[model samples]
Structure formats: C-alpha cells, structure tokens
Target: TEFARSEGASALASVNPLKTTVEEALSRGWSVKSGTGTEDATKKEVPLGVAADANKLGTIALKPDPADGTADITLTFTMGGAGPKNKGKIITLTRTAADGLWKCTSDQDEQFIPKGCSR
Candidate 1:
C-alpha cells in the first residue's frame, strides 16, 4: 500500500526513525561530533569525526529546490589527534518513497561508518 500522506516531510519522519540511523551508527562506534552535533539539530558546519560524547549523528536535512519529493539523509564524524592528517568522514544515505515505507539508500568507512551499506 502507498503511504497515506503525499507530502514526504511527515511520512519521512515516521518512516525514517532516528533509531535505525542512530543505533546503526553507534553499533560501529560512531558518535556525534563535539561542538557540532546533529542528533538534536545544532550548528550546520557539517561535523566529521567521533566526539568524546555518546550520541549518534542521525539527522537528514531535506534538500532544497526539489522540496521533499526526495531526500538525502546522513551523519558526520571527524577523527583527529591520531595521524598527521586530521581527516573527517561523511555517511550519506539516499531514499525515495514508494510503498508503505521508505527504501534504503547507501554511504563509508570504520573511521566513522558501518560494516556495509545494504538496504
């Protein structure tokens, strides 16, 4: 069955629960970046790396122009104090609505990623 609501904002919220993204990220030791956390929607500087805190970065900001017809959600993490290159990583998962629920998308590494990107 198709989703009852045509507009994707509400349905997207319901379909894409934070639990999946949150636990999924944390399951692999990914945590919200310090000073810039999206678990509760903070600054928009795009964090990259694991902060000392314990929170999963699971918030997908809807794209503009295209509206909510489709969206690309993701998380950010930056691992520093290890190597000469203080690098960060991004994990993005895209999806479109169809049946009663939204579909799985894809994204990155163990530095701040999952074991795999399977739907």
Candidate 2:
C-alpha cells in the first residue's frame, strides 16, 4: 500500500514543526502508532525531550484517497487530556509525489489542513 505509506508519511509531516526530507515520522515521534486505519493512533503536542510542558498526545486517524493516481489524504484528530476546544476534528491533506518523495501540500495550524488542499 504505497498510498498508505504516503498518507502516513505526509500526514505526519503536516503536523511536524521540524519537518525533514528523511521524513522519519516515527523517529521524529510523528504519531503514537504507525500505519493507517482506525485501530489506534496518537500524536504529540510537542517534540520529545521538551521538559517545559508535560507530554501530551492526541488521537489521530488517517484515510487515503480511494482512487489511484491521486494524492489525497484525510486525517482526523481528537484532542486528548485538557487540550484545546477543537477536540474532534477532521482535515484533509494532499501529497505530490516527486523524486520518490511525497510532499504534503498543506501547512500545520489550528485547522491542520495541507498547503494546497485548503479551502
């Protein structure tokens, strides 16, 4: 499932502040679990090793585009603990595959929508 991998990789990038080309989403602690589907998922409020704020993670759900030859990704996040007001939310991101790299076309913000996929 190349699209699954792409959705996972790019979806992680959409939330990461310090994005990278290696795009080690897992190493960078992009999500609590790897892969797509609704089994279980979590994401961090801040990068690991930051002691100022208590460690926090939010639920995440990913879904790849149904059609092929398309770079569309759907992500859902349910804020955990005493998090923000927008607890359960859904956002979609698009990826552009180039040079063997899937680039997320969105930027991370309160909305969490990808760059070019924003309405």
Candidate 3:
C-alpha cells in the first residue's frame, strides 16, 4: 500500500503544488537528498515548489540492476488539472544511482529528487 499512498499524494500535489499536503509528504523522506560531497555529505531536504516536488512526485520503489550501475524506480503522476483529461500516467521508472544518490539515467531520465536531480 506504500506505492498507492505515494501515488495518491502525488496526485494531490499535482493538483495543488502549493498545498501543505505536498509539504507534509516531503518531510517524510520521500524526496530528500543525501549528497556525497565531502562538504555537503549530509542529506539536504528540499523546500516547497511545484517543479521541485515533481521530482518526488510519483516514486514508489527503488531497485538496483547489478548489471548496470543504475536503479529502477517505478512512478506515477497526476495531471494537476493543468492538462487534458487522461493525460496522466501510472508508469514504471527505471533509474540509476551514483555517489550514493539514485538518479534517472539513459531512457528513464525522469527523476524525483526534490531539489531536482542533476545529471
């Protein structure tokens, strides 16, 4: 039910990017970042924003593929009433992790890193 809960929150966040629903979700460690840089070795929690929240918008799982240095992340997102109907997707996201941070690389470049993921 974790994934379902995440998806629901994602839908709500998509609808109201400025709502506290999104903020409370962020506080739970969904999209917080823990970078590996020496000076910034600790995890950094992102502030509130539509675009930034988009990163944490729909992630429900993180699994690594040993063949590649990447992790596969499944996700879903709501249209936020900003687009035509039936435009949203409950999709599978395939991503990679580097420097201890999971990221979207190659074909699945969409990510959810609150601060936004850098390639």
Of the candidates shown, which would achieve the greatest TM-score relative to the real structure?
2
Model 1 lDDT per residue over 1-119, tens place: 43212222222232245435433443444442323344433322223322323222223332221222223333322222112222232233343323213333222222322333332
In terms of lDDT, the poorest run of 10 residues in model 2 is 45-54
Enumerate clash totals for all models, in the order shown: 4, 4, 3
lDDT of 1 at 44: 21
lDDT of 3 by residue, 34-100 (tens): 2112221144333233342344443222122111223332222333322222224333323323432
**Residue 29, candidate 3: C-alpha displacement in angstroms:** 19
Q: What's the C-alpha lDDT at position 79 in model 1?
A: 27
TM-score per candidate, in order? 0.26, 0.29, 0.22
Candidate 2 regions exceeding 4 Å error are: 1-14, 17-55, 65-71, 82-84, 90-92, 96-119
The global C-alpha lDDT for each of the candidates, from Candidate 1 onward, is 0.31, 0.33, 0.31
Give the lowest summed-lDDT range of ten residues in model 3.
Answer: 59-68
